[PDB]
Amino acid sequence: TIPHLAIDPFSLDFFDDPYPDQQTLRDAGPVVYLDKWNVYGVARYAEVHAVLNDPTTFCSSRGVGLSDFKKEKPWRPPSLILEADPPAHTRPRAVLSKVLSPATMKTIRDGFAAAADAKVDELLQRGCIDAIADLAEAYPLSVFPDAMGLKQEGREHLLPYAGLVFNAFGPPNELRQTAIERSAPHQAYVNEQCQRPNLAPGGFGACIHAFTDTGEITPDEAPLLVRSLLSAGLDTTVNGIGAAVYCLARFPGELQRLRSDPTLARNAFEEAVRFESPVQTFFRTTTREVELGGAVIGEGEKVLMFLGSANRDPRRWSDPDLYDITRKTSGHVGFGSGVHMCVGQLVARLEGEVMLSALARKVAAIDIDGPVKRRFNNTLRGLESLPVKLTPA
Ligand code: HEM
Ligand SMILES: Cc1cccc(C(=O)O)c1
Ligand SMILES: [Cl-]
Helix, strand or coil, X not given: CCCEECCCCCXXXXXXXXXXXXXXXXXXXXXXEECCCCEXXXXXXXXXXXXXXXXXXXXXCCCCCCCCCCCCCCCCCCCCCCCCCCCCCHHHHHHHHHHCCHHHHHHHHHHHHHHHHHHHHHHHHHCEEECHHHHHHHHHHHHHHHHHCCCCCCHHHHHHXXXXXXXXXXXXXXXXXXXXXXXXXXXXXXXXXCCHHHCCCCCHHHHHHHCCCCCCCCHHHHHHHHHHHHHHCCHHHHHHHHHHHXXXXXXXXXXXXXXXXXXXXXXXXXXXXXXXXXXXXEEEEECCCEEECCEEECCCCEEEEEHHHHCCCCCCCCCCXXXXXXXXXXXXXXXXXCCCCCCCHHHHHHHHHHHHHHHHHHEXXXXXXXXXXXXXXXXXXXXXXXXXXXXXX
16 A cells, blocks of 8 residues: 655755655655654645654654654653643644744844844855855854853854754664764753853853743753753754855846845745755654544654655645745745644744845856755755855946
């Protein structure tokens, strides 16, 4: 009834060019079985969206990586939000929502925008830069650790820790096992910065700890909620902004449209998140036997959702393989969908918007002028190196 495929969606060959294999996964059927890892897969928009929006049947508390927490110990204490189901999910989610709220965005927008403008000005003085290290990494590193309230010392641990976290959702391949081997100093740093005295007043971390007296969370929950922001809040935006610059570099017609109307910046970033899908995949675990797309899945089965594939499914999107900054992007699943839909999406969009605004106002051309190198991670899609020449407007 269900087609069986040998495609390994966590192989370097797949990461290097996932699009043919994603079409093979979509076209094989609404539900596939991946013999390499003994999991079900859904790669079409309809089934990915259905799975995301039924958290009772497709739960997160048995892990959103390949490992089933009912069968194996999690490599770190479970996240109180990502790896929780309702009702335990609900109040921690509400706290992070209020921490990363519209009012918070209003307090930080001017500073985030000034830092974006300053970075682009600095890069234009160099002309030839690496849009990963020098822009996609450098700009989030210049705003997000400060917005968290982190001290200066030890920030070099943040990107390695996040790469470890996203590799650890994967199967036990070499990427995952090497990440865990090297993890001890990054975990130690991160767990220490989650404690209330190490988070500067007014930042996101202090605000989480200040929410521990309302009856929503207790003091002993606040460090792991800070940990969620230090896990998910930096490396995602690095790959989101990197995706947007890579798109603008490959589609000069769209850079020209963005220059002519910088108010398209926010949608140009949203389209980059759909088009590249920095977070490629997440899993759920079935809590019962369930019929999905005419297939019957037993209880306690892992289901791999291909978010990037759903965002390119021609059953849902017209010309899905085109980067179009005026596309109606509403409904893409690059931030997820439903009760776990990215609680940091306003921070991500703020960063992406103000960076793309700075590019739109200051840069006339973005030309790849060196070898492009991909970065391999079991969950994140993005580049290691993106040499570009920036021509000033
Ligand atoms: C381009 C940037 C980003 C992308 C593509 C992205 C993607 C996602 C996705 C797909 C999910 C859903 C997970 C699931 O359904 O299991 C999610 C959830 C989440 N994200 Fe984001 N994210 C981004 C930025 C951020 C930022 C900046 C933060 C924090 C400041 C953050 C914190 C979180 C958290 C804490 C969750 C868990 C929410 C929940 O389980 O209720 N993310 N993200
Ligand atoms: C979306 C996401 C990614 C990585 C870690 C977390 C977390 O809650 O720790 C969330
Ligand atoms: Cl940790």
